[PDB]
Design a binder for these strands. Structure first.
Length: 131
DNA sequence: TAGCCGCCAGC
DNA sequence: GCTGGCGGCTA
């Protein structure tokens, strides 16, 4: 976690789950508790705030419960299935000026969300249980 | 500009 | 040993 980072910095402005290149591009990669450190690449982001979130998805997936991530936002949607109010309300007003503006990925961020609930992307039944 | 690699390093 | 992130060559 902070461990890999100390050379650049024990703890600093950029987030956990993040790499920095000379141009400044940011890079998403994860390894598995269970596969002994093999690396699969979740993606690549410019963005540091949604960075933690790229790792969010991945790491909700891996721990399984009480996932180890920065921040605490929990989201509940009601009543539905039919929650246009909650999409629009939670979304507005959340924005990053430089990154979201790249275009098209505005559409996917603008309706939702900021923090999402996903389940065991990491495991394939049958696998009970992890470590 | 991006990805994979490889040591190494703090929790 | 955990799990990231440095880290810098090559892809």
């Amino acid at each position: 976690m902070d461990q890999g980072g100390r050379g650049v910095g024990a703890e600093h402005g950029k987030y956990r789950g993040v790499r920095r290149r000379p141009w400044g591009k940011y890079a998403a990669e994860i390894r598995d508790s269970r596969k002994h450190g093999e690396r699969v690449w979740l993606g690549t982001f410019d963005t540091a705030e949604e960075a933690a979130r790229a790792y969010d998805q991945a790491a909700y997936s891996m721990r399984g419960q009480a996932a180890i991530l920065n921040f605490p936002h929990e989201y509940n949607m009601g009543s539905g299935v039919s929650s246009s109010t909650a999409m629009a309300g939670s979304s507005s007003a959340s924005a990053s000026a430089s990154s979201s503006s790249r275009q098209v990925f505005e559409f996917e961020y603008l309706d939702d969300s900021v923090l999402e609930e996903l389940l065991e992307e990491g495991e394939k039944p049958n696998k009970g249980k992890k470590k």
